[PDB]
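TASK: fixed-backbone design
INPUT:
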C-alpha cells in the first residue's frame, strides 16, 4: 500500500535508542458548530479503538435517554401550542397535561409504565405527528423519533441502554475534551474544543428557520483559511447525512441556498453543499479539503471514514509527527 510505503521511509526512530518502541503522535482538533456531531465522533473513537461503552458504562446513560425522550416529546407538544396543531383525537389533550404533571414532579429523568403510556399515546397521535413533521419550525432533538419510536424497549423496567442509545444522546458538554486512542500505531490526541482538523457540519440544519448552514460555512471559511492551519490537513465531515437524506425529500435546498437551481434530490443537494463549503478555500492550488459525508451515530461509517482520514494523515503529515 502507498501509505505503507509512505510510513516505511521514515528514519527518525533510528535516532532514538529504543525508537521502534516510541509513540508517533497525531494531534487532532475536532471542530464545527454546536450539536454537529463532535461528541458522537469522540464516542465512536472509543467504541472503535478502545472498547467504548460497556454495558456497565451504558447503564449510566439511562436517565439521559429518559431525559432526552421526555424533552423531545415535551418540545413537540409545547410546539403544537405555538403552531396551533390540534390533537388528532382530543382525548390526547389529557395525556398532554399528564406529561407535564409527571415531568413536572421531577428533577431528573425517569420512565414509568404510566409515563410510557402517556408518551406513546401522544407520539402515535396524528396531530402530534403533524407537529413532529414541522420540526424545522422549532427546536427539537435529532434523536427524538429515534427514541420515541423505540419507547417500549426503553420503557421496559429492566432496560439497559445500547451503544446506539448512548451515541444518540444529546449531553451538555463544557470545557475542552481530550481523547487519546491509538489506530494504525498512531497515538492520537483528539481535542474537541495540529496535525489535522475534522470540521463537522450538521447537513440537516439547512431548512432550519443568520442561517445555521451559513454560520457553519462562515466558520469553516475562517478555519481552513487560517495561516496557523496552513500545514494541517483539513477534513470536512458533512454529517447527519441520514437526517439530510429524509429531509431533502420534502424540504427544499432553496430554504438554505435560495439561488440553488439543481434538482432537490439527495445527490444534487448534498453535492451542492459540499461545493459551497470547499469553495471557501482561498488557496485551492495549495490546499485540498478532504470531505466525507457522515452519519456520526453509525459506527461502521465512522470506522470506514476514519480509516480513510487516517491514510490521508500518514500520506500528508507523518513527517511533522513527533516521536515520544
Ligand atoms: N441521526 C444522526 N444523529 C446524529 C449524527 N451526529 C450526531 N447526532 C445526534 O445529534 C446530537 C448532537 O450531536 P453531538 O455529537 O452532541 O454534537 P456536538 O455539539 O457537535 O458535540 C446527538 O443526539 C447525536 O447523537 C448523525 O450523523 N446522524
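OUTPUT:
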Amino acid at each position: 500500500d502507498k501509505a505503507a510505503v509512505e510510513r516505511s521511509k521514515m528514519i527518525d526512530r533510528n535516532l532514538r535508542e529504543d525508537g521502534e518502541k516510541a509513540a508517533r503522535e497525531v494531534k487532532l482538533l475536532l471542530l464545527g458548530a454546536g450539536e454537529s456531531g463532535k461528541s458522537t465522533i469522540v464516542k465512536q473513537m472509543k467504541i472503535i479503538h478502545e472498547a467504548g461503552y460497556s454495558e456497565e458504562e451504558c447503564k449510566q446513560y439511562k436517565a439521559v435517554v429518559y431525559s432526552n425522550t421526555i424533552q423531545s416529546i415535551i418540545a413537540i407538544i409545547r410546539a403544537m401550542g405555538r403552531l396551533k396543531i390540534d390533537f388528532g383525537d382530543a382525548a390526547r389533550a389529557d395525556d398532554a397535561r399528564q406529561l407535564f404533571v409527571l415531568a413536572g414532579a421531577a428533577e431528573e429523568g425517569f420512565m414509568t409504565a404510566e409515563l410510557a403510556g402517556v408518551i406513546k399515546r401522544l407520539w402515535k397521535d396524528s396531530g402530534v405527528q403533524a407537529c413532529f413533521n414541522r420540526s424545522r419550525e422549532y427546536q427539537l432533538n435529532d434523536s427524538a423519533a429515534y427514541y420515541l419510536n423505540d419507547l417500549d424497549r426503553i420503557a421496559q423496567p429492566n432496560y439497559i441502554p445500547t451503544q446506539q442509545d448512548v451515541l444518540r444522546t444529546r449531553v451538555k458538554t463544557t470545557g475542552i475534551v481530550e481523547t487519546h486512542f491509538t489506530f494504525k500505531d498512531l497515538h492520537f490526541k483528539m481535542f474537541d474544543v495540529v496535525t489535522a482538523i475534522i470540521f463537522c457540519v450538521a447537513l440537516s440544519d439547512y431548512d432550519l428557520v443568520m442561517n445555521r448552514m451559513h454560520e457553519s460555512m462562515k466558520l469553516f471559511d475562517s478555519i481552513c483559511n487560517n495561516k496557523w492551519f496552513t500545514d494541517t490537513s483539513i477534513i470536512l465531515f458533512l454529517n447527519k447525512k441520514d437526517l439530510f437524506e429524509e429531509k431533502i425529500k420534502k424540504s427544499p435546498l432553496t430554504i438554505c441556498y435560495p439561488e440553488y437551481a439543481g434538482s432537490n434530490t439527495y445527490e444534487e443537494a448534498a453535492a451542492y453543499i459540499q461545493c459551497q463549503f470547499e469553495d471557501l478555500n482561498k488557496r485551492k492550488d495549495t490546499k485540498e479539503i478532504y470531505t466525507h459525508f457522515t452519519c456520526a451515530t453509525d459506527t461502521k461509517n465512522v470506522q470506514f471514514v476514519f480509516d480513510a482520514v487516517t491514510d490521508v494523515i500518514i500520506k500528508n503529515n507523518l513527517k511533522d509527527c513527533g516521536l515520544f
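COMMENT: Residues 233 and 313 are 7 Å apart (CA to CA).
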